[PDB]
Design a protein that fits this description.
There is one protein chain. The protein is mainly alpha-helical and about 270 residues long. The protein has two domains: about 90 residues, Muramoyl-pentapeptide Carboxypeptidase, domain 1 (Orthogonal Bundle), CATH 1.10.101.10; about 180 residues, Orthogonal Bundle (Lysozyme), CATH 1.10.530.10. Helix content is about 55%, strand content about 0%. The N and C termini lie far apart (about 45 Å). Bound molecules: nickel (II) ion (NI). Nickel (II) ion binds next to helix 4. Nickel (II) ion (NI) binds next to helix 4.
Length: about 270
């Protein structure tokens, strides 16, 4: 039930802090129990609302947030933007069918649909069911089971999805696009601080490809420098792009230009 999911949630107490306390406060506000802007720190405002919420619902009202209190929240909260408000595309593997969807997602998350379109194209050529033969990567944005799970717990409620144990919703274009835009948001947010420029699609693809941390260093690590040197895990993971046909390491600029070209093939 919702009890099993609340069962694996972290048991929270006044004094804790982190993504969990953040998910908690969101749910409390989304339940009608105002705690304020979620900050990730379980203080007094949060404690008093938890207690009341527990009393209003006949739960052990001691301020401790366990299985039962979590399940109740997952049960009462009202999703600000249910993913069903995003329309399904009329067809699969179609860029034109995906357009209206990405427009709705842009209105919902703020991320430009041209960008969402480019990514869904490079990742799955618009097949929202495609499942990589070399990994978990599934759907339009080819989400791995790990990253998907993380994305659900941290943004899911916002769209009416608390858990996807199977990771099966990665095949649904609506939720994948929403989650995809949230991922892009985190990344463009990490990159812009260190960049006298608005992150480009290529910049964001690098973050999508090598991780936000990896890309951050890369996007600012000497043009004519040997990439494989600074990015060993990345270089060993994609030798085809980090090394020339003869085995020698390419320069940073060469890796970038190579990537920017892969992206270019999927724009407009
Ligand atoms: Ni409990």
């Amino acid at each position: 039930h919702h009890h099993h999911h609340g069962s694996i949630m972290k048991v929270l107490r006044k004094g804790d802090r982190g993504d969990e306390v953040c998910q908690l406060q969101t749910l409390l506000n989304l339940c009608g129990y105002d705690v304020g802007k979620p900050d990730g720190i379980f203080g007094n405002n949060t404690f008093n609302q938890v207690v009341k919420f527990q009393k209003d619902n006949c739960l052990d009202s001691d301020g401790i947030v366990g299985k039962n209190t979590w399940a109740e929240l997952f049960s009462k909260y009202s999703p600000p933007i249910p993913y069903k408000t995003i329309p399904m595309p009329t067809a699969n593997k179609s860029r034109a069918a995906a357009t209206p969807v990405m427009n709705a997602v842009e209105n919902a998350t703020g991320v430009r649909s041209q960008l969402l379109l480019t990514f869904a194209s490079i990742e799955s050529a618009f097949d929202y069911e495609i499942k990589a033969k070399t990994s978990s990567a599934t759907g339009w944005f080819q989400f791995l089971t790990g990253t998907w799970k993380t994305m659900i717990e941290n943004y899911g409620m916002k769209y009416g999805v608390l858990t996807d144990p199977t990771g099966a919703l990665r095949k649904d274009p609506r939720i994948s696009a929403l989650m995809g835009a949230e991922l892009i948001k985190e990344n463009m947010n990490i990159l812009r601080p260190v960049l006298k420029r608005e992150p480009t699609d290529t910049d964001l693809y690098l973050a999508h490809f090598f991780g936000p941390g990896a890309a951050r260093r890369f996007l600012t690590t000497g043009q004519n420098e040997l990439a494989a040197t600074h990015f060993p895990k990345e270089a060993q993971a994609n030798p085809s792009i980090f090394y020339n046909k003869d085995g020698s390491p390419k320069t940073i600029q060469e890796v970038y230009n190579l990537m920017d070209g892969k992206v270019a093939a999927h724009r407009k």
